[PDB]
């Protein structure tokens, strides 16, 4: 058996593979769907802060402008989210 | 309420702080410990291939050489792991 940590990481890959296309990449409307379905509290925090994260996230995370989100671009996206929570845990405000 | 996804992220942050002692960063011995307790299979997989990941992980990831791993350096570490497991999902062997 694998530790929780290991399990947790595999989960993200499983999550990824729930929204990818044949090419192992996620298109924009799917990426938005993914966001809405899996990080709603995060989003509600940005909108309450007056920020609509979904408006440009795709545009900011598609670093190579291939109109697709690959796993690495995907990793970065999660990175930004984790990061916001971290700052939160040291007091900081959500979406900051 | 929190999705599986959100909780999983918060968990990573919790795991992180477990090894920070009273401050906000992880020393080398603490990181190695974190690795052994939370990624044993990834580790064994590495050893089986004849690779001891622990040998330079700290050195590889302390990008700013302050001889501590801050949350950002940490996320990069977990990226390398996540990335390995991604590839495994496409067949490939652990620790490659
Ligand atoms: Ca892209
Ligand atoms: Ca450092
Ligand atoms: Zn894939």
UniProtKB/Swiss-Prot annotation, chains A, B:
The modification N-acetylserine is found at residue 1. Ca(2+) binds at residues 62, 64, 66, 68, 73. This is Protein S100-A7. One of its GO terms (cellular component) is nucleus. Interacts with RANBP9. SUPFAM superfamilies: EF-hand. Pfam families: S_100. Keywords: Acetylation, Calcium, Cytoplasm, Disulfide bond, Metal-binding, Repeat, Secreted, Zinc. Zn(2+) binds at residues 17, 24, 86, 90. GO terms for biological process: angiogenesis; antimicrobial humoral immune response mediated by antimicrobial peptide; endothelial cell migration; epidermis development; keratinocyte differentiation; positive regulation of ERK1 and ERK2 cascade; positive regulation of granulocyte chemotaxis; positive regulation of monocyte chemotaxis. Its main location: cytoplasm. GO terms for molecular function: calcium ion binding; calcium-dependent protein binding; RAGE receptor binding; zinc ion binding; zinc ion sequestering activity. Disulfide bonds join 46-95. It comes from the Eukaryota. Residues 12-47, 49-84 form the EF-hand domain. It is found in: Cytoplasm; Secreted. The keyword Cell cycle does not apply. Fetal ear, skin, and tongue and human cell lines. Highly up-regulated in psoriatic epidermis. Also highly expressed in the urine of bladder squamous cell carcinoma (SCC) bearing patients.
